[PDB]
């Protein structure tokens, strides 16, 4: 029994990982119709930031050699025309590098042995020209997607293992995986947006959480645990810079457990050492990126290290509130002083977009950039419909019941006011997971799209219902406990099958015929080195296909993109036309591409259209003729005499418009 249980746990974890992989693949094939799409049409299916990421993978796989492809992407001069940038550490393009490094030898070795990894067939679309659709592992798109989905499949396994760890039973893991599967749409979006950074990084973040829970539960230590924690932290840090903030919320969780005498000294040392080593390795592998410093993650590392290493000097303290308050003050003071003392003190860059978005929601801070962020609904408050969906499947009620039970047991089992510095109070992993859930819930409620973190932790905390100690021990017998636990599963199936049925009976649309004509015209009527400017979603696809150099791009986290974007988007302002022409000449752009729906009044949500956004950023030019009116008039009357410096070179069916800067 002691060995049959563990083998069964591991096998079920692998099985649920495979099932999740198959499910996400089916959803992706239903949504995007890649089975009957040409290669350039798949690039079109990769929209605003997905296209910018995939273009570097395509660049490396088409380079004469892997090293020259890396040298070309680390000395890039076509993403931001005017200077040279290193996109490998700026955009976190390590997954692309790894996938290309694996793809090139694979096709090279398959070709030598004549293995037919790719099969191509003609697809007749209709009035448009027929194209060729190639399906197989040899196709670069399918190789990339298979890598993404193989990585993303392990999230179900990690959730199963976390459910087993916090409940000591397979029933907890089953509850966690069932809650994850019935709320799959509200938990992840990798099926609809593969090339996003979170698709690569979140599995490693949740794996790191699982390993940390295992280490805390069994009080492990040594170099092996450090290696295990680092092998998850480093890949998660090299991908998705936002990972840093996530690892901040983990640290704040660990501290709150450690201050309650639930984490021994040696394992705390092991955890903090693993974090230090992982941060150093990531900082060195990201070419000394200053924005990694002066984040919230490094000062937190230093603060928690100092808190841990001064813990034995305070072992004589008996009043628990004083101990906890003193530790919290030291932690907060160190992290705040180090963050302020390096960003404002020395000007070591920093990415304060999170703080600015949060300031605009509570205060009256408006800004142009925060207005771009908070009018898209994936950076606004969470919607009530999502809460209704989560309560309908009985995920939130289960989590609330489990949290109440844990709080009651913790209160009844722990001496609140007096501490003994030599006794470990047990159940530290559960408290760490509960505090992490609270942090993730606050994050997701403030900014929607941070649900990626909240929903799996709700599934994990729901598994506390299967913990025997929390819910009566031997007072609820064993036959009753199993009887009630299968009842919960039966009720969950009754309210989860409709959700998965709905999620499987949704078929997407894949026409987008206008952008294909626009890109065809770009490829035929413009030269290879023509510089293009416009809205960022259009620019990322203009770079991905037609390979033309661009000025601005949708990657907005770093610095020196906001000024370029603010200068490019002046074509929608009320500035004099000569001034915007001079601005375009100074940036060196040749063509400007936009849509006629970008210059449309809304009157339902003003000041989320560019017409109303520019009045706050440029009050003095209010009362002038808006540039959008001139663009619409020129596109309609077909004679571009009033816009003398500019000239409309592309105008088809009044959707996409391309102006030439003379």
């Amino acid at each position, epitope marked *: 029994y002691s060995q049959t249980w563990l083998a069964s746990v591991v096998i079920i974890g692998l099985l649920v990982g495979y099932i999740n992989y198959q499910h996400v693949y089916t959803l992706f094939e239903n949504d995007k119709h890649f089975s009957h799409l040409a290669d350039f049409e798949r690039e079109m299916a990769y929209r605003t930031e997905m296209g910018l990421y995939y273009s570097y993978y395509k660049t490396i796989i088409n380079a004469p050699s892997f090293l020259e492809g890396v040298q070309e992407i680390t000395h890039d001069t076509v993403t931001e025309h005017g200077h040279e940038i290193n996109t490998l550490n700026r955009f976190n393009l390590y997954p692309e590098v790894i996938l290309a490094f694996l793809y090139r030898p694979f096709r090279a070795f398959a070709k030598s042995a004549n293995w037919q990894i790719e099969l191509c067939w003609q697809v007749n679309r209709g009035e448009l020209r027929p194209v060729e659709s190639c399906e197989g592992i040899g196709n670069p798109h399918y190789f990339y997607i298979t890598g993404v989905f193989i990585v993303a499949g392990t999230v179900a396994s990690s959730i199963f293992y976390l459910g087993v760890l916090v409940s000591d039973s397979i029933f907890g893991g089953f509850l966690s995986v069932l809650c994850f599967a019935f709320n799959h749409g509200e938990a992840t979006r990798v099926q609809w947006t593969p090339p996003l950074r979170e698709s690569f990084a979140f599995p490693f973040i949740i794996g790191h959480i699982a390993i940390l829970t295992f280490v805390i539960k069994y009080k492990k230590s040594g170099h092996s645990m450090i290696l295990l924690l680092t092998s998850m932290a480093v890949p998660a840090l090299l991908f998705w810079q936002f990972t840093q903030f996530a690892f901040f919320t983990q640290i704040c969780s660990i501290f709150l457990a450690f201050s309650l005498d639930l984490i021994p000294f040696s394992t705390a040392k092991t955890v903090i050492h693993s974090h230090i080593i992982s941060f150093l390795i990531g900082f060195l592998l990201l070419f000394g990126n200053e924005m990694m410093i002066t984040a919230l993650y490094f000062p937190s590392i230093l603060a928690l290290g100092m808190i841990i290493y001064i813990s034995p000097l305070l*072992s*004589n*303290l*008996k*009043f628990r509130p*004083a101990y906890v308050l003193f530790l919290a003050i030291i932690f907060a003071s160190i992290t705040l002083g180090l963050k302020i003392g390096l960003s404002k003190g020395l000007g070591i860059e920093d990415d304060a977009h999170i703080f600015d978005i949060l300031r605009s929601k509570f205060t009256s801070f408006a800004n142009f950039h925060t207005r771009l962020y908070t009018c898209s609904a994936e950076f606004d408050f969470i919607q009530y419909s999502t809460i209704e969906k989560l309560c309908g499947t009985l995920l939130i009620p289960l989590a609330l019941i489990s949290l109440v039970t844990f709080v009651f047991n913790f209160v009844k089992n722990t*001496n609140l*006011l*007096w501490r*003994n*510095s*030599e*006794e470990i109070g047990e159940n530290g992993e559960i408290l760490y997971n509960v505090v992490q859930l609270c942090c993730s819930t606050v994050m997701a409620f403030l900014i929607m799209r941070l649900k990626l973190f909240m929903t799996p932790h709700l599934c994990i905390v729901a598994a506390l219902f299967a913990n025997s100690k929390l819910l009566g021990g031997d007072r609820i017998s064993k036959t009753i406990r199993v009887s009630a636990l299968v009842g919960v599963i039966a009720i969950l199936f009754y309210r989860g099958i409709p959700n998965i049925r709905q999620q499987l009976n949704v078929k997407g649309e894949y026409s987008n015929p206008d952008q294909e004509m626009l890109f065809d015209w770009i490829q035929h009527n413009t030269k290879q080195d023509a510089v293009f400017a416009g809205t960022m979603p259009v620019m990322a696809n203009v770079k991905l296909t037609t390979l033309r150099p661009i000025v601005n791009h949708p990657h907005y986290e770093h610095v020196g993109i906001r000024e370029r974007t603010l200068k490019v988007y002046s074509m929608f302002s009320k500035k004099p036309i000569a001034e915007v022409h001079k601005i375009m000449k100074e940036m060196g752009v040749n063509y400007f591409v936009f849509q006629l729906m970008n210059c449309s009044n809304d009157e339902r949500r003003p000041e989320c259209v560019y017409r109303g956004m520019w009045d706050e950023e440029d009050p003095k030019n209010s009362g002038r003729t808006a540039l959008c009116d001139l663009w619409i008039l020129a596109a309609n009357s077909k004679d571009n005499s009033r816009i003398a410096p500019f000239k409309i070179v592309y105008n088809a069916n009044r959707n996409y418009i391309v102006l030439k800067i003379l």
Partner: antibody
Amino acid sequence: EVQLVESGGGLVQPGGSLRLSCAASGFNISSSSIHWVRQAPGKGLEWVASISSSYGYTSYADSVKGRFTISADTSKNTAYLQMNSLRAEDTAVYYCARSSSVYWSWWGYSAFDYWGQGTLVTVSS
Amino acid sequence: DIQMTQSPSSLSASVGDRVTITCRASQSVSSAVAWYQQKPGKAPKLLIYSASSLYSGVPSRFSGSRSGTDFTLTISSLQPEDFATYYCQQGASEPITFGQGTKVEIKR
């Protein structure tokens, strides 16, 4: 000098209510915590209850939690202890001792330095 | 919920003899232990606090020693006056628990 005086002991019938007081001379209240210690005949010292009047903390022993009540005022520098539903083994001599305040516990309570003379109370039928 | 156990419940020694009384704590109270002396029919008085500090007023003959979670109060020279009951107290938890109480006698 600093001293503790207690009054209210004597004879009472079991199951009734008693209401005694402990006053202090010298130090002002709310600067320190005060505890009640009982001693039964032929038995040792048993801690009963404690109160810090600085911000209003009261604590009781498990064996007597649910009957005892302490209220301390700051104007007249004294505390008032009330018992109800006395048992047959609650007879004892009570002492009103002084120690450091709970809010400044900080490595624990200080030892009882200034004790009270104690009042003897008996329950009889 | 903490037990203050004294093994020498009854101790008989002559005048001038060195006497030692031990005190064992179930938990790990660091230095929150105090010693009290109570005369028959009187109120207890503080002798030793923090297991190593001598109260101002008690003669310096009294000594307190600590080893782990074990504590001891010793008197080098026994005299007529230090004939009373001795109590051991802990102060690291809200339920304050006293020792069992040891009685000193006159060997004759």
